[PDB]
Every structure is written in C-alpha cells, then in structure tokens.
Amino acid sequence: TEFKAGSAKKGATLFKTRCLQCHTVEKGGPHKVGPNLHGIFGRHSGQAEGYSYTDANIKKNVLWDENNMSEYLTNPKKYIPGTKMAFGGLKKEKDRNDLITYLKKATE
Ligand code: HEC
Ligand SMILES: Nc1ccc(O)cc1
C-alpha cells in the first residue's frame, strides 16, 4: 500500500535467509519444501512447474502483482487457510517493498 522501490542487493539478503530455506528464486534449483517462485508475477496462485498446492491456494487464484504479493506475505494462514507455507509472514511493509524489487528484477 505504501510501496517504495528498493534494490536487488538488499531484497536478496532477506529472501536468501527467510524464503531460500524452502523456495527457489531462479529456475535451476529443484522444488524444495516450497515451489519455484521464478515467474509468478502475472500468474495466479498455484502454478509451479512440477509441484502440488493445497485445496485453499488453488481455489484462491490470486493474480501475483507488485502490491498483491505483500497481501499474502503479511499472513499466509489468514488469506489461505490450511496452506503449507508456515514461514510466519513478514508484517513490516517497508521490509517487503525492497523484497518485491529483487524478485521483480529476476522475473522481468
Ligand atoms: C517453507 C517453510 C516456506 C518458507 C520459508 C516460505 N514459503 Fe512461500 N510457500 C511455501 C509453500 C509450501 C507454498 C505452497 C502452499 C500450498 O499450500 O500449496 C508457498 C507458496 C508461496 C507463494 C505462492 C506460489 C503460488 O501460488 O504459485 C509465494 C508467492 C510465496 N510462497 C512467497 C514466499 C516468500 C517471498 C517467502 C519469504 C518471505 C516465503 N514464501 C517463505 C513454503 C514456504
Ligand atoms: N504484474 C506484475 C507485478 C509485479 C512484477 O514484478 C511484475 C509484473
């Protein structure tokens, strides 16, 4: 909502020690505890190339956009009840703002 542009060398440090544990930022790493995120921008929820999703994440079909990605990041359990992502949710919007720029740079 109060988005502010970041830089690749900042968002990566966070994602690499917060999201890396289960996910993959590029398309060379096999699907770990979480699906591949490389190319989600512009697609609906539940579209990983070779990985299954929950009954609630599919029915949800959220169009992963710049602001929308934060909507779910703040609380995955509240938006998608029953989802496998048990990461906790990064409540601080200023902190996600920079994270979006990094992923955004990797997808486009
Ligand atoms: C492992 C415990 C996880 C951590 C840490 C993070 N995520 Fe996650 N995420 C995980 C799973 C297993 C799933 C699928 C949920 C299901 O029930 O099927 C997800 C999904 C997402 C998605 C949506 C993918 C899609 O719908 O195609 C996004 C955009 C996403 N996760 C982002 C994300 C970020 C940026 C994280 C760090 C803050 C993060 N996840 C950590 C498991 C895990
Ligand atoms: N629609 C959209 C949103 C965010 C991105 O990083 C790319 C494309």
Ligand 2 nearest-atom number relative to CA 68: 3
Name the CA dihedral angle for 38, 41, 42, 44, rounded to a multiple of 10 degrees.
Answer: 80
Ligand 1 nearest-atom number relative to CA 58: 26
- The Cα 47–Cα 71 span in angstroms is 18
What experiment produced this structure? NMR
Q: Which domain holds residue 35?
A: 1-108
Ligand 1 nearest-atom number relative to CA 33: 1
Please report, for the domain that includes residue 50, its CATH number: 1.10.760.10
Whether residue 44 has its Cβ less than 6 Å from ligand 2:
no
* Tokens of residue 45, six digits: 């929820």
Kind plus residue range of the DSSP H or E element containing 72 = helix 68-74
- Ligand 2 pocket test: pick from 64, 72, 98 the residue with the most ligand atoms within 8 Å of its Cβ: 64
Question: 93-107 vs 8-15: helix axis angle to the nearest 10?
Answer: 110
Of 95, 102, 97, 92, whose CA–CA distance to 12 is shortest? 102
The ligand with the least distance to the CA atom of 67 is 2
Number of domains in the chain: 1
